[PDB]
Tab-separated table of C-alpha atoms in Angstrom:
chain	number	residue	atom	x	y	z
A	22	UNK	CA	20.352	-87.309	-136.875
A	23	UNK	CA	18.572	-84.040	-137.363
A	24	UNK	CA	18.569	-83.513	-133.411
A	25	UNK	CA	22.080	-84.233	-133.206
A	26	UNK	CA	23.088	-81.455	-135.613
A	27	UNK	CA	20.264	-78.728	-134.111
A	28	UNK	CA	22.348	-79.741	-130.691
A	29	UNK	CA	25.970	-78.773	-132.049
A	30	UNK	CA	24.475	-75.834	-133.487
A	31	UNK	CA	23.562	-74.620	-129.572
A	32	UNK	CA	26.717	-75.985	-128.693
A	33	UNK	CA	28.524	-73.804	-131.454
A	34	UNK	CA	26.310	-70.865	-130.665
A	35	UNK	CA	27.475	-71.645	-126.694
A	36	UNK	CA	31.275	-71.689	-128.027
A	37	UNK	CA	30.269	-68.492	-129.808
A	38	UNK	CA	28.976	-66.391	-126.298
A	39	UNK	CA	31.869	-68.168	-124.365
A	40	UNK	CA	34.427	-66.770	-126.695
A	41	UNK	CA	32.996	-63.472	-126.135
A	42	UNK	CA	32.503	-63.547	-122.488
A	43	UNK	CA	36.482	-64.756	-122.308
A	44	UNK	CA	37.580	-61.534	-124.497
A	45	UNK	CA	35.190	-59.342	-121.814
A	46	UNK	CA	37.117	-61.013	-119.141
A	47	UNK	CA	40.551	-61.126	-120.332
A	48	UNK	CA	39.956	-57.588	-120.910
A	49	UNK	CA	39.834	-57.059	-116.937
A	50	UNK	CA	43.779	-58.211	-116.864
A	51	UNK	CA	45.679	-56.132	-118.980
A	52	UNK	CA	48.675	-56.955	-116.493
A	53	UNK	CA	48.299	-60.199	-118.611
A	54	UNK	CA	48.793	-62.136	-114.933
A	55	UNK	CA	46.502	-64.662	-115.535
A	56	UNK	CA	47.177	-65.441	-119.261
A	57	UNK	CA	49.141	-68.240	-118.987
A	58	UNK	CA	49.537	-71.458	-116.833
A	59	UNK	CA	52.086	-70.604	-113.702
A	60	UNK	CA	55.440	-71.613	-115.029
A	61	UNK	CA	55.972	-74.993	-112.985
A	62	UNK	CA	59.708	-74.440	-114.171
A	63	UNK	CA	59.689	-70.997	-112.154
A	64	UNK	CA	57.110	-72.125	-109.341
A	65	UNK	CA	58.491	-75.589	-108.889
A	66	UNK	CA	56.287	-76.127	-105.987
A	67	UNK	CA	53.036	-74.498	-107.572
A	68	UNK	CA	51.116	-78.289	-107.411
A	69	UNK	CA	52.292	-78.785	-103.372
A	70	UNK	CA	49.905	-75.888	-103.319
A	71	UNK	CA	47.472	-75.617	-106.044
A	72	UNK	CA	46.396	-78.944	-106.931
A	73	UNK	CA	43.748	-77.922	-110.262
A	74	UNK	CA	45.923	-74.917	-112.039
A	75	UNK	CA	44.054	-73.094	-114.429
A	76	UNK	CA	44.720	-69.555	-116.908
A	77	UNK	CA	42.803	-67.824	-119.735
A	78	UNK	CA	45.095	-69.601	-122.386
A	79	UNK	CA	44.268	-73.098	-121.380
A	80	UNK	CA	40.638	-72.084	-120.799
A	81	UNK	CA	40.416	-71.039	-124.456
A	82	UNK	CA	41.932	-74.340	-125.860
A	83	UNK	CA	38.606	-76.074	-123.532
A	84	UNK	CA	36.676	-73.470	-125.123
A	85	UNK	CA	37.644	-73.953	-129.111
A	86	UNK	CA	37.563	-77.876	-128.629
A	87	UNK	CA	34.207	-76.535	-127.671
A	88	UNK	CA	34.776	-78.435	-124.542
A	89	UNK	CA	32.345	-76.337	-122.392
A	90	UNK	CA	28.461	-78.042	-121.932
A	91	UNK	CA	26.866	-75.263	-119.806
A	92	UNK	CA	28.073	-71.678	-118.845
A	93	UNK	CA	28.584	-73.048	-114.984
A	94	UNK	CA	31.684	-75.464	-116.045
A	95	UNK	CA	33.027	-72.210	-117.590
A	96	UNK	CA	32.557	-69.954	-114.694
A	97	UNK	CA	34.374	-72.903	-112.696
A	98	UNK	CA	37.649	-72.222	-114.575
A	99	UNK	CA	37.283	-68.649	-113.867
A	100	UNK	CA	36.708	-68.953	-110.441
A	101	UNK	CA	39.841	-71.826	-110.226
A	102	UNK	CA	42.003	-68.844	-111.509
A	103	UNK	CA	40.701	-66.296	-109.300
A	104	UNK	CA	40.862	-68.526	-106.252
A	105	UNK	CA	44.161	-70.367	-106.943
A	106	UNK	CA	45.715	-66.611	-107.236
A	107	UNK	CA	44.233	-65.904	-103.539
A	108	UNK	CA	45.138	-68.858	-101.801
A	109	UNK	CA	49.070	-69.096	-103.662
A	110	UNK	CA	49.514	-65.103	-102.993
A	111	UNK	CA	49.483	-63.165	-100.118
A	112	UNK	CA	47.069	-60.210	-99.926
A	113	UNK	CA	49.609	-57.332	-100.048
A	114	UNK	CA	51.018	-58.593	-103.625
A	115	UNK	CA	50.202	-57.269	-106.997
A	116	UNK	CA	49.020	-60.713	-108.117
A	117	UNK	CA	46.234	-61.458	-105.184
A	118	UNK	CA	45.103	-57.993	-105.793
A	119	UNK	CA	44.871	-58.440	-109.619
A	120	UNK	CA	42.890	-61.719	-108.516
A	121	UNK	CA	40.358	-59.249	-106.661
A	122	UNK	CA	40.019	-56.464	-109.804
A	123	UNK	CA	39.419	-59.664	-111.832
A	124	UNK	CA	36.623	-61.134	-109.628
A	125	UNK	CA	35.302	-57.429	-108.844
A	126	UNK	CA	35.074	-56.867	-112.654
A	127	UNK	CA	33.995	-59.956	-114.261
A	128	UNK	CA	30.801	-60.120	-111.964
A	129	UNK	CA	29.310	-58.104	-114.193
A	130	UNK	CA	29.983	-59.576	-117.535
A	131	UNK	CA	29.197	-62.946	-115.678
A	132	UNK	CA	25.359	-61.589	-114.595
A	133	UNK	CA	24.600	-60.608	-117.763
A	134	UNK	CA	25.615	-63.357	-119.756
A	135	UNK	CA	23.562	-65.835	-117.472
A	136	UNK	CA	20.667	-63.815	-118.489
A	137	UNK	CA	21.770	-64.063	-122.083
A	138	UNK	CA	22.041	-68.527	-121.942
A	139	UNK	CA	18.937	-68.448	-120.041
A	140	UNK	CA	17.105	-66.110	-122.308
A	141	UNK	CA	18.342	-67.423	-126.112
A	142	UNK	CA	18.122	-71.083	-124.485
């Protein structure tokens, strides 16, 4: 149908602001600590701890499948990475702290591009 196209073009368009709101965010690690899933290999016991592990690389295979509806599943993986860093970490290590620069930083990029879904629909 014609309505089924016009909704994969929002979708796409979605994909499109997602993509750029994961490049604003990634940009807030440049320790590169939460690009990648925690090695289970190293961590061995990461899942007796963290039981839904998340990280910018498999966010961005969700996000090119275009496997985000709404920008609130998205912000759940970011928050899953922030808050599986917190909990796994103690709070005098580099990585909880990186978790808190992350959070602190991508608030902003986050408020603005709920205005920006709300406001092109």
């Amino acid at each position: 149908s014609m309505e089924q196209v016009a909704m994969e073009l929002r979708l796409t368009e979605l994909t499109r602001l997602l993509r750029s709101v994961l490049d604003q965010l990634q940009d807030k690690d440049p320790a590169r600590i939460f690009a990648q899933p925690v090695s289970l290999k190293e961590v061995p016991d990461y899942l007796d701890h963290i039981k839904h592990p998340m990280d910018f690389a498999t966010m961005r295979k969700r996000l090119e499948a275009q496997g985000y509806k709404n920008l609130h599943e998205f912000e759940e993986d970011f928050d899953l990475i922030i808050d599986n860093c917190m909990k796994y970490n103690a709070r005098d290590t580099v990585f909880y702290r990186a978790a808190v620069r992350l959070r602190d930083q991508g608030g902003v990029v986050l408020r603005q591009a709920r205005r920006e879904v709300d406001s092109i629909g």
